[PDB]
Write a protein that binds this ligand. Sequence first.
Ligand code: FES
Ligand code: FES
Lengths: 78, 64
Amino acid sequence: MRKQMVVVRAEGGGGINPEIRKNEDKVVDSVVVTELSKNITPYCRCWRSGTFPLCDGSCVKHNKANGDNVGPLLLKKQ
Amino acid sequence: GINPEIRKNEDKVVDSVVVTELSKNITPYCRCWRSGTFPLCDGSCVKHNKANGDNVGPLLLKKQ
Ligand code: FES
Ligand code: FES
C-alpha cells in the first residue's frame, strides 16, 4: 500500500503482524515449560513487542492508539 | 486493530496458564485473536493467514 524501494504500509489491510519475522511462513514459537525461570513470564499476543515473543508492554501503546484491548499470556510455574 | 471481538468488556485481555496443569504434550495458545476456543489455538490462524496474506501463529507450550 503506497510504493515510493520503500513500501509505506498505509491504513489497514486484513493482517495483524506488519513487521515481525515476515520471512517466516508461519511465526510459531515454542516454549518447553520447564525452561521457565521466573514464576510468571508474560508472552506477547499483540505482535508489537520489541522482545517478541515476550511481552514488553507495547500492547498498552497499541490499545490506546487503536481502541483495542489485547494483552499477554502469563505463563506461571505455580 | 488486532482483536475483532474477544472479551470487549475487558480493557486488557490477559490469560494465565499454570504450566503443571497442561494435559497435552504440546498445547497451542492463540496469538491471532480469531480462535473459537481462545485463548487456545483452533487453527483459525491458518485461514486468517490465507485470506489476509499474514503469517501469524500460535505459541506452543511443550512438555518434551
Ligand atoms: S507487548 Fe504484546 S501482548 Fe504485551
Ligand atoms: S487460532 Fe489463533 S494462533 Fe491459531
